């Protein structure tokens, strides 16, 4: 599924991400835009042999099992395929574990480089929330 900006903001709000660990909804929408272009089916292979999955590009070395990442920790206890669903529940539940892990949203390279310290409220401007 390719989400619209306001559609995704509404879905993320219903799943409890607005101000989760102090990160306003715009931070999450900005992260999804630059990680996946709002596409739930996005995948990207890394040099270390791990793969990033879904709307928030969650990595197979630590967070999900894809059966081809040796030494996989599978901390969200989910097959990586579950993160590619039109239903973002699995991605949101796993993201809540990641953002609690100590480094907050710096875990997402695209958030640190393209969202952090910008006017992230712009990402939810015009939306009925
Ligand atoms: Cl915001
Ligand atoms: Cl959803
Ligand atoms: Cl933090």
From Swiss-Prot:
UniProtKB keywords: Allergen, Antimicrobial, Bacteriolytic enzyme, Disulfide bond, Glycosidase, Hydrolase, Secreted, Signal
One Pfam short name: Lys
Catalysis: reaction(s): Hydrolysis of (1->4)-beta-linkages between N-acetylmuramic acid and N-acetyl-D-glucosamine residues in a peptidoglycan and between N-acetyl-D-glucosamine residues in chitodextrins
Keyword match Hydrolase: yes
Residues at the active site: 35, 52
Tissue: In the egg white and polymorphonuclear leukocytes.
Disulfide bonds: 6-127, 30-115, 64-80, 76-94
GO molecular function per UniProt: beta-N-acetylglucosaminidase activity; identical protein binding; lysozyme activity
InterPro entries xref list: Glyco_hydro_22, Glyco_hydro_22_CS, Glyco_hydro_22_lys, Lysozyme-like_dom_sf
Binding-site residues, substrate: 101
Similarity annotation: Belongs to the glycosyl hydrolase 22 family.
Full protein name: Lysozyme C
The organism's taxonomic lineage, starting at the top: Eukaryota, Metazoa, Chordata, Craniata, Vertebrata
Subcellular location as annotated: Secreted
Enzyme class: hydrolase
General function of this protein: Lysozymes have primarily a bacteriolytic function; those in tissues and body fluids are associated with the monocyte-macrophage system and enhance the activity of immunoagents. Has bacteriolytic activity against M.luteus.
Example GO biological process: killing of cells of another organism
A Gene Ontology cellular-component term: cytoplasm
Quaternary data: Monomer.
Residue ranges constituting the C-type lysozyme domain according to the UniProt record: 1-129
EC number: 3.2.1.17
Further facts: Lysozyme C is capable of both hydrolysis and transglycosylation; it also shows a slight esterase activity. It acts rapidly on both peptide-substituted and unsubstituted peptidoglycan, and slowly on chitin oligosaccharides.
Gene: LYZ
